[PDB]
Symmetry: C3
Subunit: 148 residues, 3 copies
């Protein structure tokens, strides 16, 4: 199998795919909150679900969208950086630690965001998860630059 | 050519690139709507196009942005999942079906969103397109986990 | 090293990673602006930083978010297109020009956006950067289609 193209690749693919699924979970929750709070973004949606007054914003829906947006600001870059990093021959354990810190940090971020946990819990989880991303980015820079 | 690295790869690259172009089409439409409705996000844009009163929101511009945002929530994960999936040796026809369902579902989603089609047309197209994504995600999980 | 899988790959990886770092810079600036202007998205953040009145929108924060959103609309597609394009055996110099135009255009875009530069400076930088993306997309289409 091509999953074994590099020793770190299976771990990367596991963590990344779990994170994509975690984003889908946020999308599912968003839809459920819209229905429960009757807060739809579009007049055509609202008319199907009780009337035009239900085309409206809701703080919980907005919170869900912020969590999803933050995921797009952070998880998408990881999908790129982690994939490339997997092929740079990093120490297997060190690579695992990079991926695990990101996975744990981001799952915790979503829990802290949607669960409305006190500050600075969410901020800390964001910062923690960005650390391995910064690390991988710099490593890719050096490897790319030296092969120019 | 490296497009033939796997039997499913050409089909994946065709569908994905068409979807990226489809997102660019949404960006183009957004710009056109801003100009036609004179609804700009920035004061510097507004002053160039008639005066400060044109720094304002517009429902059609907001709708365009929602379509583009939903694309980012769905097409970007597909770019990752579909690429990885292409190298897992899936049945060529089965892989084609995954990619085609996503392509058709997402093009239909944009038509339903921007065309303001009645509910639940847009919701159905979203759900249909997410099915092959869920399928690919699970397959990657099993392959990654078993190579740990 | 696997960075030399294709002659254009090192240049692509350099430009892409710099652009990811440039997006992280926007995220950092956004956080700094929120703190300076005391404009937080969440009640729990506001209570930590002076009181509930600081859960509020701010034009500079909104501008930062627009720059970041536009990055997600443009840089993320480049990460995909440029990676694939690197393996299609393009002329090394021509490939470098594609990547450099995108890098320069996007850095200029962020400067023009956050610096509130007069129209049409930002619009021009956006359009300039999209040109190599359109070019790569079409090239991938032809290569993918011909291998079906
Ligand atoms: O009405 C909604 N979804 C639906 N989805 C379906 C559906 C989707 C796939 C298969 C069958 C039915 C039938 S109504 C909806 C939910 C949240 C927000 C807005 C809307 Cl417009
Ligand atoms: O004025 C706008 N675009 C322009 N683009 C150009 C341009 C771009 C590339 C090459 C030449 C001219 C010249 S004015 C604009 C459109 C939608 C929203 C906001 C603005 Cl600020
Ligand atoms: O208060 C904030 N960040 C913090 N971050 C920390 C922190 C993060 C990582 C390690 C140590 C402390 C401690 S307070 C904050 C900033 C902008 C917006 C909202 C918030 Cl809630
Ligand atoms: C990967 C998806 C993570 C979902 C985590 C959701 C956390 C929900 O947690 C809930 O949050 C509520 C406030 O929103 C609180 O009132 C509840 O006490 C708490 O159980
Ligand atoms: C890939 C890009 C897809 C663009 C599809 C745009 C669909 C436009 O469709 C139009 O929608 C209008 C409402 O917005 C209706 O008034 C018109 O009858 C309809 O033609
Ligand atoms: C990659 C990150 C790029 C950051 C570029 C920030 C540009 C800041 O530039 C500043 O913009 C201010 C208005 O916002 C002006 O008042 C100042 O004159 C100008 O120096
Ligand atoms: N787009 C972010 C940029 C900075 C960021 O990601 N901050 C973290 C830690 S405070 C966060 O969780 N932001 C909340 C959010 O993006 O909604 C923002 O607006 O805050
Ligand atoms: N971010 C989405 C999450 C759920 C979702 O993607 N729903 C589909 C089917 S109702 C959709 O088209 N949402 C409209 C949108 O994202 O603007 C939302 O706010 O609705
Ligand atoms: N989502 C974009 C689509 C078009 C676009 O990307 N336009 C460029 C040139 S005017 C831009 O910088 N848009 C500002 C933005 O996205 O906030 C928009 O709303 O304008
Ligand atoms: C907030 C910034 C986090 C810093 C990440 C550190 O990242 C480290 O950078 C070093 C120098 O580039 C590298 O030698 C090392 O491999 C890398 O892990
Ligand atoms: C809404 C959830 C959609 C379900 C997608 C089904 O996806 C299927 O999952 C099976 C078990 O993991 C796999 O054996 C199979 O290859 C895959 O197509
Ligand atoms: C706004 C549209 C920009 C046009 C990009 C041009 O892109 C060009 O397209 C040609 C035909 O597909 C290709 O032969 C060529 O390799 C490519 O650079």
């Amino acid at each position: 199998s091509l999953v074994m193209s590099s020793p770190a690749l299976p771990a990367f693919l596991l963590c990344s795919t779990l994170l994509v699924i975690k984003m889908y979970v946020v999308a599912i929750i968003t839809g459920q909150v819209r229905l429960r709070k009757k807060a739809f973004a579009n007049p055509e949606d609202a008319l199907r679900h009780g009337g035009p007054q239900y085309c409206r914003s809701d703080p919980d829906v907005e919170r869900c969208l912020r969590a999803h947006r933050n995921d797009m600001e952070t998880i998408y870059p990881f999908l790129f950086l982690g994939f490339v990093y997997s092929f740079l021959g990093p120490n297997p354990f060190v690579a695992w630690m990079h991926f695990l810190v990101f996975l744990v940090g981001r799952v915790a971020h979503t829990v802290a965001y949607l669960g409305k946990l006190r500050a600075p819990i969410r901020s800390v989880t964001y910062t923690l998860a960005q650390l391995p991303c910064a690390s991988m980015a710099l490593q890719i820079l050096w490897e790319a630059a030296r092969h120019l």
